[PDB]
Amino acid sequence: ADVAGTSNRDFRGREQRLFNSEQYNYNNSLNGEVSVWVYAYYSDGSVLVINKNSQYKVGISETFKALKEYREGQHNDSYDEYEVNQSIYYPNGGDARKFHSNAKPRAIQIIFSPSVNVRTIKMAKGNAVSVPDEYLQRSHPWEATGIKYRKIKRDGEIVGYSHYFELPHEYNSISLAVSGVHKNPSSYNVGSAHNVMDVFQSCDLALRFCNRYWAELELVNHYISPNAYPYLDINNHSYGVALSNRQ
Amino acid sequence: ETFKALKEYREGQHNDSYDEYEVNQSIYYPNGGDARKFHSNAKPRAIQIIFSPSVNVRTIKM
Amino acid sequence: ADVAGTSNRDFRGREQRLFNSEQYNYNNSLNGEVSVWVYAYYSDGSVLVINKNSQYKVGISETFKALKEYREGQHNDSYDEYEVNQSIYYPNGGDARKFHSNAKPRAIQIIFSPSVNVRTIKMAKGNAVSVPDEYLQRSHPWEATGIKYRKIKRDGEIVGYSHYFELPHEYNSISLAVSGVHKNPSSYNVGSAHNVMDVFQSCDLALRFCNRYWAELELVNHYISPNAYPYLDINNHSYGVALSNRQ
Amino acid sequence: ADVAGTSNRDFRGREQRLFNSEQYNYNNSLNGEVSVWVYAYYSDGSVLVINKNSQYKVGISETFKALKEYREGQHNDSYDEYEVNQSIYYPNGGDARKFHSNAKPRAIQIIFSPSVNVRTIKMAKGNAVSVPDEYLQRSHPWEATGIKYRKIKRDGEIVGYSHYFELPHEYNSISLAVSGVHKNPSSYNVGSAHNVMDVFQSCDLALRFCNRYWAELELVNHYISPNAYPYLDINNHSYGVALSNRQ
Ligand SMILES: Nc1nc2c(ncn2[C@@H]2O[C@H](COP(=O)(O)OP(=O)(O)OP(=O)(O)O)[C@@H](O)[C@H]2O)c(=O)[nH]1
Ligand SMILES: Nc1nc2c(ncn2[C@@H]2O[C@H](COP(=O)(O)OP(=O)(O)OP(=O)(O)O)[C@@H](O)[C@H]2O)c(=O)[nH]1
Numbered sequence: 056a057d058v059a060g061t062s063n064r065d066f067r068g069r070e071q072r073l074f075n076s077e078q079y080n081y082n083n084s085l086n087g088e089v090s091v092w093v094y095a096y097y098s099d100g101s102v103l104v105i106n107k108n109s110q111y112k113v114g115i116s117e118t119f120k121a122l123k124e125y126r127e128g129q130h131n132d133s134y135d136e137y138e139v140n141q142s143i144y145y146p147n148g149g150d151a152r153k154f155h156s157n158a159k160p161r162a163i164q165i166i167f168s169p170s171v172n173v174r175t176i177k178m179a180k181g182n183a184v185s186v187p188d189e190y191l192q193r194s195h196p197w198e199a200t201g202i203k204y205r206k207i208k209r210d211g212e213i214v215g216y217s218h219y220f221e222l223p224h225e226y227n228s229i230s231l232a233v234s235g236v237h238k239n240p241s242s243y244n245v246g247s248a249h250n251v252m253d254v255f256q257s258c259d260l261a262l263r264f265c266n267r268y269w270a271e272l273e274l275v276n277h278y279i280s281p282n283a284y285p286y287l288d289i290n291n292h293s294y295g296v297a298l299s300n301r302q
Numbered sequence: 303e304t305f306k307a308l309k310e311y312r313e314g315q316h317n318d319s320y321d322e323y324e325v326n327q328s329i330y331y332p333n334g335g336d337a338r339k340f341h342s343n344a345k346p347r348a349i350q351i352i353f354s355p356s357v358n359v360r361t362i363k364m
Numbered sequence: 365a366d367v368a369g370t371s372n373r374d375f376r377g378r379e380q381r382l383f384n385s386e387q388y389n390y391n392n393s394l395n396g397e398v399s400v401w402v403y404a405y406y407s408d409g410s411v412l413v414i415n416k417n418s419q420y421k422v423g424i425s426e427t428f429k430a431l432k433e434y435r436e437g438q439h440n441d442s443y444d445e446y447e448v449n450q451s452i453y454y455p456n457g458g459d460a461r462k463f464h465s466n467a468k469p470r471a472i473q474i475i476f477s478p479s480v481n482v483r484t485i486k487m488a489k490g491n492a493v494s495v496p497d498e499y500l501q502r503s504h505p506w507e508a509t510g511i512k513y514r515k516i517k518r519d520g521e522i523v524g525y526s527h528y529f530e531l532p533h534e535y536n537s538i539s540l541a542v543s544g545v546h547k548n549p550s551s552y553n554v555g556s557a558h559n560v561m562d563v564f565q566s567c568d569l570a571l572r573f574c575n576r577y578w579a580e581l582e583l584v585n586h587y588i589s590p591n592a593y594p595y596l597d598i599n600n601h602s603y604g605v606a607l608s609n610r611q
Numbered sequence: 612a613d614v615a616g617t618s619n620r621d622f623r624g625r626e627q628r629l630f631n632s633e634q635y636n637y638n639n640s641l642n643g644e645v646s647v648w649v650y651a652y653y654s655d656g657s658v659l660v661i662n663k664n665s666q667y668k669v670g671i672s673e674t675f676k677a678l679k680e681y682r683e684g685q686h687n688d689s690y691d692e693y694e695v696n697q698s699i700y701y702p703n704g705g706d707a708r709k710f711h712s713n714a715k716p717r718a719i720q721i722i723f724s725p726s727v728n729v730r731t732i733k734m735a736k737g738n739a740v741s742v743p744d745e746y747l748q749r750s751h752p753w754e755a756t757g758i759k760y761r762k763i764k765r766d767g768e769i770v771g772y773s774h775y776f777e778l779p780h781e782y783n784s785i786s787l788a789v790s791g792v793h794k795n796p797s798s799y800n801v802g803s804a805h806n807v808m809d810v811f812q813s814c815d816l817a818l819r820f821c822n823r824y825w826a827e828l829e830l831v832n833h834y835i836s837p838n839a840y841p842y843l844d845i846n847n848h849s850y851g852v853a854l855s856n857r858q
């Protein structure tokens with residue numbers, strides 16, 4: 056046989072490159088996944104991740120209460136935290152024993168898989184009683200925030216998209232939903248009558264994952280990296296795997 | 303349902319809830335947790351899916 | 365001096381081989397130990413080991429209750445488990461909040477040291493109220509189960525004997541005692557009048573060991589291997605050390 | 612065929628009677644069980660049963676502490692009960708908050724299977740520090756109490772033997788061991804040299820059972836009756852099954 060790495064007959068090299076290219080391209084087909092992650096960062100350095108993976112479109116919707124830190128199997132000041140919520144829903148509405156709950160997120164990062172179309176991304180960032188813009192009567196139910204997403208890149212390839220915003224002020228008390236649509240450069244509308252019931256089934260088939268990691272390092276090591284997920288850390292370093300035309 | 307949601311939960315009884323957080327960490331990534339057991343008895347041993355007879359079987363997706 | 369490994373004057377090699385042979389043969393003398401282990405395997409992957417080591421003869425006897433899983437320093441549903449025992453002693457006799465106690469053993473392995481005589485092994489596998497065979501009136505107090513023991517082998521040598529049985533069914537609710545006698549190819553009966561009081565003293569001198577390990581791996585690493593004990597794991601792999609005529 | 616119940620050719624009737632006779636006689640053979648029960652009765656109406664079943668001989672030995680009532684999975688005043696024991700071991704030796712512990716047995720019943728030889732029964736009824744008769748120096752280690760055992764009878768047959776004694780006084784604070792030997796009308800001594808190692812193995816093979824029932828009714832219904840055990844209740848009623856020459 057030809058010697059490795061010296062000719063066009065290195066079929067192991069050609070198949071390795073095809074194996075990667077096919078994964079990249081499958082994810083972008085209408086048969087592929089589109090995925091979103093919301094990361095809520097807490098002052099103790101822990102991170103709640105919520106992930107949803109589905110065909111055609113995907114999103115996540117959470118209340119103010121649901122994004123607060125919850126330590127499984129530990130004390131959580133649960134009575135005082137009921138009172139904190141009352142005081143956040145209406146000023147002076149509660150009887151809490153603290154000025155600032157350390158369970159409130161200090162920051163949110165939203166990441167989409169590279170199979171999203173960025174122009175379809177929509178976010179409803181509401182106040183603590185789940186209203187998008189001060190009063191229901193004057194609320195558009197979302198903002199199209201695609202222009203703010205940064206490309207997470209590895210070896211020159213877009214491995215995902217990130218929108219990050221800090222919540223450093225006492226008044227940053229939010230509810231949050233986000234949504235994006237899978238790329239579709241074709242003129243076959245996946246929600247047109249021929250396929251609309253498949254998209255209804257996709258609403259039931261979407262898989263969700265939720266967990267609190269103790270540190271960004273642990274999130275990088277045990278969540279992002281093992282699953283070949285995109286990520287951007289506090290030092291602006293990009294994680295992910297480049298696949299298109301690569302061995 | 304998530305992996306976590308299908309685990310056994312005994313309402314109003316002890317559920318080893320701290321150890322079970324650690325079991326989940328060890329299931330999400332090998333050697334990722336610090337649990338005090340090899341196998342969680344809260345993990346399902348089996349799943350049965352049943353549909354009503356009004357389903358069309360060719361549309362079922364899992 | 366002669367060079368190592370090249371002549372009959374490698375006295376270090378001769379002494380190494382004698383050191384091993386003497387241990388093998390001492391254990392088989394009437395001055396040596398005979399040992400039994402009972403392993404009760406639980407559905408959480410943990411393993412109760414009971415070991416007894418004595419001269420002349422050895423055994424272990426346990427109730428249904430004693431073989432149930434007990435987690436030292438943790439919750440054990442101890443009130444519900446009293447009710448589980450009532451329901452196991454007589455059908456519908458208890459008021460438990462579960463159909464199957466996960467503390468019930470899923471399997472038993474009995475292992476004897478290679479100094480046992482296999483034809484002397486006896487087992488009383490009783491029901492949950494400690495009766496060998498349905499009713500006392502019709503019970504022979506034991507079954508001689510030696511024919512069922514497998515040889516645990518390493519490098520061609522018998523390092524011990526194993527009888528394993530699963531308890532996979534709801535009705536497998538047992539009490540258990542086992543017993544074996546140290547080899548004695550001589551015509552000197554160790555229980556004849558000259559030595560019988562020594563065997564009575566051996567009943568008092570027998571050393572017992574009991575502990576729950578969290579996994580078969582941990583049992584292999586920290587119990588079986590450090591002490592040069594025989595074992596057979598779920599994958600049918602044999603552990604032990606061959607000693608006869610070996611360096 | 613002949614009609615049932617009218618001739619010597621009712622082979623189903625003959626086999627039924629043989630089936631019962633064989634159980635009766637097997638239990639009395641040297642291959643059969645001999646069994647002892649100790650029942651400790653508490654003032655709350657509950658009953659601790661300890662049972663031992665073995666070939667050749669059988670007994671039970673318990674400390675003062677071990678015979679005290681223990682409610683599995685409930686409060687047991689365990690600190691105060693340590694102090695009660697100190698005050699029972701030596702007058703004014705403890706710092707308990709009660710004059711009389713309700714965990715002390717009010718009565719003991721010892722029952723043997725009908726395969727015991729009554730003349731071999733021995734009892735060591737000690738004081739609370741486990742001394743048979745006031746001081747060790749003057750103690751015979753047992754009393755042969757067979758003459759006091761009553762025959763428990765059903766349909767004319769001895770189904771077992773009972774010795775009962777109340778402990779109604781404040782000073783009735785006891786430790787207790789009992790022992791009996793299986794019948795052997797032969798001149799083959801089961802402990803002579805030919806078989807002595809089998810009797811040593813029987814010491815390891817003896818099966819034990821222990822449990823606290825909440826009432827004598829529950830003991831009758833769920834312990835005595837289902838297992839065809841002999842018993843004598845507080846009303847002097849005999850329980851058991853007659854088997855010899857019976858359908
Ligand atoms: N492309 C490129 N890579 C370099 C150069 N110097 C060092 N590198 C390293 O080499 C790696 C890329 O190597 P290759 O994948 O073999 O080169 P390629 O440009 O992808 O070409 P093909 O894989 O043959 O299509 C990068 O990760 C760089 O860190 C350079 O001049 N050009
Ligand atoms: N006996 C034997 N062992 C082999 C052979 N080939 C590889 N081995 C390995 O060598 C090991 C045994 O080596 P030795 O103990 O030196 O050979 P031996 O047969 O015991 O002979 P002595 O120790 O000199 O009595 C085994 O564990 C084998 O895995 C072979 O042909 N014969």
Ligand SMILES: Nc1nc2c(ncn2[C@@H]2O[C@H](COP(=O)(O)OP(=O)(O)OP(=O)(O)O)[C@@H](O)[C@H]2O)c(=O)[nH]1
Nearest residue numbers: 616624625627628765766767853854855856857858
């Ligand atoms: N033996 C006997 N039993 C009676 C009499 N009257 C009523 N019985 C009842 O009948 C039962 C015994 O019946 P059987 O077992 O048929 O009589 P048996 O004397 O044992 O005779 P075989 O069984 O034929 O050997 C007892 O439980 C009594 O309650 C009587 O006069 N004699």
Ligand SMILES: Nc1ncnc2c1ncn2[C@@H]1O[C@H](COP(=O)(O)OP(=O)(O)OP(=O)(O)O)[C@@H](O)[C@H]1O
Nearest residue numbers: 206207208209210211212213214291292293294297
């Ligand atoms: N020394 C080099 N000269 C020319 N091209 C290079 C060199 N090193 C890498 N490249 C190529 O340039 C492209 C971009 O790779 P690069 O590693 O710069 O991007 P990245 O990992 O997305 O971002 P960065 O490394 O800047 O964080 C890839 O195709 C890569 O192989």
Ligand SMILES: Nc1ncnc2c1ncn2[C@@H]1O[C@H](COP(=O)(O)OP(=O)(O)OP(=O)(O)O)[C@@H](O)[C@H]1O
Nearest residue numbers: 515516517518519520521522523600601602603606
């Ligand atoms: N390649 C070989 N050819 C001949 N004899 C061998 C070879 N390898 C090992 N032996 C010898 O054969 C005997 C049996 O050793 P072996 O390792 O097969 O037994 P074991 O460890 O009890 O079982 P196994 O390895 O099959 O689980 C030993 O004396 C050993 O030294």
Ligand SMILES: Nc1ncnc2c1ncn2[C@@H]1O[C@H](COP(=O)(O)OP(=O)(O)OP(=O)(O)O)[C@@H](O)[C@H]1O
Nearest residue numbers: 762763764765766767768769770847848849850853
């Ligand atoms: N009416 C009767 N006349 C004659 N013999 C009887 C009668 N009833 C029973 N028997 C027989 O007398 C024997 C003794 O039975 P019985 O029921 O009197 O003894 P038990 O059950 O040990 O004691 P008890 O019934 O007095 O508590 C048995 O063989 C039985 O069949």
Ligand SMILES: Nc1ccn([C@@H]2O[C@H](COP(=O)(O)OP(=O)(O)OP(=O)(O)O)[C@@H](O)[C@H]2O)c(=O)n1
Nearest residue numbers: 129130131132133134135136138150151152153
């Ligand atoms: N504003 C508050 C906060 C707490 N408490 C009281 O202090 C007790 C403990 O507080 P909690 O907030 O429930 O904290 P933990 O019990 O420590 O935590 P958890 O409930 O999560 O286990 C409560 O039962 C409640 O009586 C209160 O009166 N008023």
Ligand SMILES: Nc1ccn([C@@H]2O[C@H](COP(=O)(O)OP(=O)(O)OP(=O)(O)O)[C@@H](O)[C@H]2O)c(=O)n1
Nearest residue numbers: 128316317318319320321322324336337338439
């Ligand atoms: N891997 C583990 C498991 C438990 N624990 C400790 O043991 C205590 C009790 O364990 P937990 O798993 O919370 O069980 P329970 O309290 O019995 O059950 P529950 O929490 O469901 O009421 C915990 O607070 C925790 O301190 C631990 O340190 N490490």
Ligand SMILES: Nc1ccn([C@@H]2O[C@H](COP(=O)(O)OP(=O)(O)OP(=O)(O)O)[C@@H](O)[C@H]2O)c(=O)n1
Nearest residue numbers: 316439440441442443444445447459460461684
């Ligand atoms: N069949 C049952 C089981 C439990 N319980 C009640 O629930 C309480 C807790 O149950 P238990 O079985 O004792 O479990 P734990 O307290 O969790 O474990 P442990 O006792 O081993 O520490 C008990 O006090 C008892 O009141 C009950 O009424 N009936």
Ligand SMILES: Nc1ccn([C@@H]2O[C@H](COP(=O)(O)OP(=O)(O)OP(=O)(O)O)[C@@H](O)[C@H]2O)c(=O)n1
Nearest residue numbers: 685686687688689690691692694706707708709
């Ligand atoms: N003579 C006694 C008896 C009890 N106590 C105290 O009261 C507490 C409770 O008593 P205890 O006898 O242990 O009863 P419970 O806790 O009710 O029962 P258990 O321990 O069996 O669960 C103990 O920790 C001990 O401090 C004491 O000081 N002196």
Ligand SMILES: [Cl-]
Nearest residue numbers: 083084085086
């Ligand atoms: Cl497509």
Ligand SMILES: [Cl-]
Nearest residue numbers: 392393394395
């Ligand atoms: Cl010897």
Ligand SMILES: [Cl-]
Nearest residue numbers: 639640641642
């Ligand atoms: Cl016989």
Ligand SMILES: [Mg+2]
Nearest residue numbers: 128318319320
């Ligand atoms: Mg807990």
Ligand SMILES: [Mg+2]
Nearest residue numbers: 131132133134
């Ligand atoms: Mg609380």
Ligand SMILES: [Mg+2]
Nearest residue numbers: 208209210211
């Ligand atoms: Mg780079």
Ligand SMILES: [Mg+2]
Nearest residue numbers: 517518519520
């Ligand atoms: Mg081998």
Ligand SMILES: [Mg+2]
Nearest residue numbers: 441442443684
């Ligand atoms: Mg409890």
